[PDB]
Write a protein that binds this ligand. Sequence first.
Ligand SMILES: [Mn+2]
Ligand SMILES: [Mn+2]
Ligand SMILES: [Mn+2]
Ligand SMILES: [Mn+2]
Ligand SMILES: [Mn+2]
Ligand SMILES: [Mn+2]
Ligand SMILES: [Mn+2]
Ligand SMILES: [Mn+2]
Lengths: 222, 223, 223, 224, 224, 224, 222, 221
Amino acid sequence: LKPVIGITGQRYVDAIQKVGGFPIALPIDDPSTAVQAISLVDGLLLTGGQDITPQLYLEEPSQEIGAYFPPRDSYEIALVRAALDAGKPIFAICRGMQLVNVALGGTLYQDISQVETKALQHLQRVDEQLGSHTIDIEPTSELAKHHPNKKLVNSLHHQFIKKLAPSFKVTARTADGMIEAVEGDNLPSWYLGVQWHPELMFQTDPESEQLFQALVDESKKT
Amino acid sequence: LKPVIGITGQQRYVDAIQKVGGFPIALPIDDPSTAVQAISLVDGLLLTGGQDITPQLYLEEPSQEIGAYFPPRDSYEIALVRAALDAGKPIFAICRGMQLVNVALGGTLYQDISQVETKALQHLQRVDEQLGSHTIDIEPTSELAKHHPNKKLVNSLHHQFIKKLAPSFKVTARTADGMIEAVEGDNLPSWYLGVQWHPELMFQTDPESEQLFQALVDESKKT
Amino acid sequence: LKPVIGITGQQRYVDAIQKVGGFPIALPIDDPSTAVQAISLVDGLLLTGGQDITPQLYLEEPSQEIGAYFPPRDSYEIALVRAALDAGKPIFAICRGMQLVNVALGGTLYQDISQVETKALQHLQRVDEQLGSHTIDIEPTSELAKHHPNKKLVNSLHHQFIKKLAPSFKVTARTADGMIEAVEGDNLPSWYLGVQWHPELMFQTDPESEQLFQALVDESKKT
Amino acid sequence: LKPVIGITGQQRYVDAIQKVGGFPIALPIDDPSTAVQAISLVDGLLLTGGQDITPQLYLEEPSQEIGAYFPPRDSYEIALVRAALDAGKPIFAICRGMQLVNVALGGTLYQDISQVETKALQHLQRVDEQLGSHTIDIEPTSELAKHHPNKKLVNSLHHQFIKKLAPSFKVTARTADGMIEAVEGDNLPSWYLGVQWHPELMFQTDPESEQLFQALVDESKKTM
Amino acid sequence: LKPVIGITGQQRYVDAIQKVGGFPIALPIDDPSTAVQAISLVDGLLLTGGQDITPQLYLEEPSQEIGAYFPPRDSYEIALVRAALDAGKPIFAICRGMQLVNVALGGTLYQDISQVETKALQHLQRVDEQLGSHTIDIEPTSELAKHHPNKKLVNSLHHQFIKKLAPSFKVTARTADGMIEAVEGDNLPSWYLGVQWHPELMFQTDPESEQLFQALVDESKKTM
Amino acid sequence: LKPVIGITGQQRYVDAIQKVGGFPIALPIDDPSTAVQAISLVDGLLLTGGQDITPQLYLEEPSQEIGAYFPPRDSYEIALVRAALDAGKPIFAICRGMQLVNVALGGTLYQDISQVETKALQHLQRVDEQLGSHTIDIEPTSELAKHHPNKKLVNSLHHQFIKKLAPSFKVTARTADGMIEAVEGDNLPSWYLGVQWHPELMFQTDPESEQLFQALVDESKKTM
Amino acid sequence: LKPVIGITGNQRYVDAIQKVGGFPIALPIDDPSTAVQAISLVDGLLLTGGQDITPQLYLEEPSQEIGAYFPPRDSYEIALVRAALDAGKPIFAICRGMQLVNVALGGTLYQDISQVETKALQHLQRVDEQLGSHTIDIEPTSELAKHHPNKKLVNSLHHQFIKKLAPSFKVTARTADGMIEAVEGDNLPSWYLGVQWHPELMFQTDPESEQLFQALVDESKK
Amino acid sequence: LKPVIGITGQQRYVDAIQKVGGFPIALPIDDPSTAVQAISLVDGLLLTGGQDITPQLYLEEPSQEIGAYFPPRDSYEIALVRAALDAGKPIFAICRGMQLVNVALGGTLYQDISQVETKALQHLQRVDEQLGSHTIDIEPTSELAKHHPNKKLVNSLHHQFIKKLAPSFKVTARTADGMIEAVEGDNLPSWYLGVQWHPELMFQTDPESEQLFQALVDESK
Ligand SMILES: [Mn+2]
Ligand SMILES: [Mn+2]
Ligand SMILES: [Mn+2]
Ligand SMILES: [Mn+2]
Ligand SMILES: [Mn+2]
Ligand SMILES: [Mn+2]
Ligand SMILES: [Mn+2]
Ligand SMILES: [Mn+2]
C-alpha cells in the first residue's frame, strides 16, 4: 500500500494524497501519547497554525504576540522528539518549522516589529496560492534539489526564527535576511523545514509539489 | 497501550475517545480504495455527524427540501464501513453516521422531516446542544439498554431520518413520534451501535453518554 | 429601608422596581433546593420574560414550532413560586413568567401561535417594543382593572400562549382573538398578577404600566 | 442555609460560587445610599470584571487611551465595599474588581498599557480565556500563597493596571512585568483578596483557582 | 422665492422637489395639534413612504402578517392632510402616503398581500428599485393620464394595499391584478394625487416621473 | 490565431474558454442597436448565467415568487442572439442563457419552481456548485450525446424553467421530473447548445464538461 | 405661535426643541442661494453635529487624518449662518456646528486630535454618549455661565477642534486640554452660543443641558 | 460603427465610454502572448483602477505596507500597453493604470504613502468618491490643460505613487503634495494621458471629467 503520513492539527491532505501517501490527521493529545502516535506512521508533516507558546522558549508573552495554544505545542514537541527517536522523516511548514526550532533549544521573534532591521512583508495580501517574496537558496541544500535560486514563495506569518537551534543550518532566506528554510545537520532523520506554505502552491507549482513527494519518498525508504 | 479509534472526517469526538482511554486518529476523506488500509490502522471506527447523505446512494434523486451533501465523503465512509465489517472491528455511528451505515447496507432515508407521513416532533432542537430535548423509548433487550434507562432524554440535530431499515439491523430506540433514534445490528460480523443523537456533546455532562464511547473502546480493545 | 424584590434572571425590570421604591436583587438560576433560601431573602417575587418553557414540564414532547428552552431555569422558577406561595409573599409575573406560574400549578400552553385553533392576532409585534400594539378586554372586577382601563393598548412579544388554565386561577384579560393576556389568583396564599405583555418596556412612558410594579412593591410592603 | 454571596453586576461567577457551596445573588447597579441595605443581605462580597473605572474618581481627566466607563457603577461599588468593610464581611475582587477597591481607598490607576514607563508584557491575552498566559511571582507569606504556588500561570484580560497602591494594602503578586497582579489587605477590618486575572474562567479547569472562591465562602460563613 | 414644499417623514424626495424648482422642508414628527402651524409654513405637502399604517386607525387589530408601524407618525400625518385640505393646498402622496390619505378620510387597507382574495402580482419588487416592474392601466380622463401614458411600467415596493377606497376619491390606476395604484380626488378642497409606487426613485432617469413632482410645484405656486 | 469568444455578463466562464483555446472578451451590457457590431468582432457567442429574464419579454406580469431581473441585459442579449444567428456563428448558452434564447425566439418560462404542475426535484442545489446533483436522460441522437453519456449527473443553480419551448428547437436532456435541462436547434443557421446547468463550475474537475466549451470553440473555428 | 427653529441636516435635536416649546423644521441641504429663503422661514437656527468641514473652506488641503466631509452641506450652512446674522436671528451651534460658524467667518480648525502640539485629552468618548466625560472651565461672565456651573462634566463626540478663533468671537469654555468647548458672539448682529459637545444627548437627563435649548427658543421668540 | 475601446479589468468605465460614443469591450486577464490579438481588436485602450502593481516588476521586493497585487494582471496589462504602442493606438490610463504604464517602461513606485519623504496629503479620500477632494496644479501647456482648469478639485483613492518617472513622459499635474497626479507622453508612438484620480466616478456629475473620455474615443476614431 502507501506510506502513512501523520499530519498534525485539508490542502495538506490533498498534497499528501496527490503524492502517493496515505494521510491521517493526529488530533492534539497528551504528550505521553506521542510515541504511540509516531508508531502509526512512516513520516510526520507539521502544519501551520498559531504562534508558539512563548514560555516554551523561555520568554513571557510580548504585547505583539498573537494567540497560542499550549497543549498543541506540547504535543507536537513530543511528536518531534519521538519522531527523531525513530529516525522517521519530518516535513514542517510555517509555524511547524518554528516548532521544530523551539523543540531543540531555539528561539523566535514574537513579532515582525521586533526585528532589529526593517523586514519585508511576510504577511502577504497577495492571493495565498502565489509567491510574494524572493528567496536565496543554499546550492548544496536538500531545498536546492527541488527549488531554483531566487524562487518566489508565499508568506503568511508575523513571527520568525531568532536563535536557530543547535544541529540545524539555514538553507533559505529572503532579501531581508530572515530565515525561510532550515535543514538538519547530523540529525537522526531527514528533515525539511520551510517558512512558507507549499500546500497552497502545489496545485499550480510543480516544484512545490516535489517537496511533498520528497517526504513521501523518504517515508518509503523506512 | 491505548486502542486506536478512527474518527471519520469534530473536537468533541476526539475528547470523548480520549476521556475513555482510546487514542483517536482522524481519517480524512480519501479514495474508496484506501479504505482497507485506513481500517488496518485502527481497532475501532467512529462515524461522526455531518451533511445529509447523497440521495443517489439510496437510489433517490434530490428533493427540494434536501440539504447539502458531499458524494466523496459518503463514498469513502461506505467503503470504511465495509472494510470494518470485513475485519470484524467495532463500529459506533452518530447522527449522519447511523444514517450512512443504514444506506451502506441497502436501507433508505426520509430526505426531510416534512416528508414523514405524520407530523414529527422537533428533531433540530433550538435548546442548548448539550442538553437532551426529546425522550426515547428503548428496547429493554438491547445494547443501548445497558447504558441508558427507558425514557432517557437525548439531544437532536437533524432533519432526515431512516425510512426503510436495512436488513440485519434492529431498531433499538424511537421518539414519541415513532422516529428511529437508535439502531443495532443483528447477526453482523462486528459489534455495532448507531444513535441518531449527539452523545459527544453530552458526555461531559452525562456519564451515561460517556458509557457509549467507553463501550466502543472496550470492544475495540478486543483486538 | 425598602422591600426586597427578587428579580428572576433584563435591566428594565430593575429600573421599574427601583423607580417604584423597591430594592431589587437578581436571582441567578440555581438548584431547585435553594428556592426556599432564595425566597427568604425577598419580600416580593418578580418573574421576567425569556425563552419558552420546557414542554416536558406540562407533559408534552417538543413540537416543531417550539423555540429554545432551558430546563434548569423553569425547574428553578417553579421551585421559586412554590416557595413564595408557601410564604404568602406577592408574585408579579411577566410574559414568560405568567406562563411559568401556570405550568408550575398544573396548567398547559400552546407551543406556537400556529397551533391555535382559531387564527390569532399578532403577538410578536414589529412596532417599537415600548408601544402598545393589541387592545385587551379587562374584567371589571379584577386587580388589573384597578390600574388598567378596559380596551387598553398593550404590547406583545411572545409566540406561545396559555392553553388550559391551572386550578385556583382566573383569566383577567384577553385580546380580541380570545387569547389570554392576564391571569389572576383565586383562593391562593399570595397576591398574584400575571400579565402576558411587557410592562417593563412601557412604564417609562405609560404611568398605568408603572402602577403594576408599584402594586408589587406595595403588596410586598406588607413587610 | 448556605452563605449568601453578593455578586456585583456574569454566569461564570455564579458557577464558581455555587460550585463552592455558596448561594449567590447578583446586586444590580443602584444608588449609593442602598449599598448598606445591599450588604445587609450578604455574608460575602464578590466584585467582578467589566469596564474601566471612571477616571475622575482617582482625580484624573480621561486620556485618549481610556476605554468606556459607567460612573453609576463605580459609585455603587465604592459604597458597596465601604459597607462591606464596615460590616466586617469578606471581599474577593476580580480584574476590574481589584482596581475598584484600590480606587475606593485612595489608590490610582494607569489609564492604559502604553502609559507605563517600561514596555509591559501582554495583559490582554489572545490565548483562550480559560488558559493562563503570563507567569506571576507570589509572596510566600501572602494569603494567595495558601492556594497558588509561586510562578503560577494566570490569564489576563485587561489594559489598565494599578499605579499607586491605596494605603493599608500590600501587593501579593506581580508579573515579570513588575505590574501588580494581586493585592491583599494590611490589617483591614475584613478578609480581602483582589486578583488582576480571571479565576471564574479558570476554576472549571484549574483546581487551585476554585480554592480562591472556596476561601471567600469559607471566610463568608466564618463571619455569621 | 420658489414654492415651499413640506416633506413628511427621504433624500430622493428632496432631490425630486429641488430639481422641479421647489424649496423643500422636512417636517419632523410632532403633536397633531401643531399640524396647522406646520402647514402654514408651506405651499405644498408631500407624503412619503414608510411603515404600514397603524391598523386601529381603520378599526382593525394587528394581523399576524402586518409589518411595523409608528402611531405618532400616523397621527401627525393625518392631522397634516386635514390642515393641508382646510388651506386648500396641493397634496402629493407616495406609497404609504397614498394609503395614509385613504385611512385619513375613512378608507381601509389590506394588511398584507397574502390577505387579498385573488392572487396578486408581485408588488415588492426584487428588480432594481429605480426601474418599473409592473404595468399599470390608467384612467384616460385622470390627472395621471396627463403625465403618464397608459400601460407604463412603474416600480413597486409595498406589501399592503388600499382595500376600501374612502369617499371623495376615485381610482386612477391599477395593475393587471386589480390592485389600486393611483387615487385622484372628487370635490376635494385641493389638488390631489396619490400613487402606490416610488416616483422619487425613478425621476432621475424617467422624465415622465419628474413631471408628477413638477405638477405638485406648479400647483403650489398656483396657491401663492 | 485563436477564435474570439464574446462572453455575456464571470471569471470561470473565461477560464473555460481560455483552457479550451479561444480568446474571450467580455461584452458589457449595451444598447441593442450595437449588437451587430458586437457579434462582428467575435467568432462565437457564450451566454452566461445571471438573473431571471424580465417576464414582460414573454407576455407575463411578475409573479410574487419571481426573482430580480434587469430588462437592459435581456434586450441586449436578445439582440445578440439574433445578430449571431444572422451571422451563422455558433452559440453556447448556460443556465439563464438557455432560457434567454428560448424567450428571444418565442418560448415561455415558469417563473418559479413552485409553479410547475408536478412536484419538481431540487434545482437550487446545496451540494457545492462544482459537483453534479441531479441525473439527466440524454437524447442519444443529440449533439449533447456526443459529449455526455446518458444518466450523467449535472449541477443545478436555478429556480426558473422553460415552460413553452420556442419553435425550431428540440429538448435533448431532462431530469427525472421531466424538467428541461438541454435544448438544441434544428435547421438553425447556427450551431447551438443550451444547457440548464453550469458546466463552467465543473470543467476544472469534469473532462466531459470541458468538451462542451471545446465544441463551441471548435465550431466557432469552422467559421473562419 | 411657537418659535420656528430651523434644524440643519445631513432626531434628538428635534426632541430638544419640541420639549422646550419651539416648533422644529428640518432644513435639507440645498443651494447656498436658497439660504435667504430658508432663514426667512424661521425665528431661530440650530446647527447640528455631523461630518468634518471640508478643509478648503478654511484654506487647507485634506491631511491624512481628516475624516469624511461633504462640501454641499458646508457651503449651504455657511450661507445659512450669514442669512441668520443678517436677519439678526439667534444661532445655537453644536459640535460640528460651532466649527462651521468659526470657519464661515475666517477661523481655522485642527484637522485631527493628533495634530495638536499639546497631547490633548480624549474628545471622542467611549462612555455612554448621554453622559459627560470631560470637565470644562466656564467663563464667569458667559452667556453659558448663566446656564451651566463651572467645572461641569460634559460629553464629546469629535476629533477636530477650533484652531484660530474667528473675528468677533470670544472663547467661552475650555477643557483642561486648552481645547475650546464653547464660543459666544462678541459684538455680533445676533445672539450666539456654540458648544463643542452634544447637549441634545444629555438634555433628557441633565436639566441644565435643557436650558441651552430653552435659551435658543426664548431668544428666538424675541 | 463606433470606435472600439478595450477596457482592462468596473461598470462606471463602460458607462463612461458609452456616454461618449465608444463601443466598449472588457478584456479579461489572459496570457501575455495574447496581448497583440487583444489590441488588434480595439481602436483604443483604457487601463483601469485595481490593486497595487507587483513589486518585482519595478525591481523591488514587497514592503510591509504594500497592499495586495496580482502578477498575472500586471503581466498582461504590460504586454497590452506594449502592443498598443507598437500599433500606435491611443491609451488612457486611470489610477493604478497610470502607475502600470510607468512601471511598464522602466519607471518606479512608492509602495505606500508613509514612505514618501514629506507627510503627504490624504490620497485615500473618505469623501463621497464622486466628488473631488484635493486640488491639483496643472501644466498650462498640458493636453490635460485642454480639459481641466488649474486648481481643479479631483478625487483620490490610492495609497501608492509614481516614484521615478519612466523616460518619454512628463508630469502634467501634482497635488499641493508634490505627488504626481497626471502623466502624458513625450514623443511616444501613441496618444497618451495618465491620470491618478478616478474620472469615471466624476463624469456623471462633472462635464470636464467626461471630456477626458471623449478625448480617448476621438483619438481612437
Ligand atoms: Mn516569509
Ligand atoms: Mn432526533
Ligand atoms: Mn399578546
Ligand atoms: Mn495581567
Ligand atoms: Mn405595486
Ligand atoms: Mn436543474
Ligand atoms: Mn470635547
Ligand atoms: Mn491623489
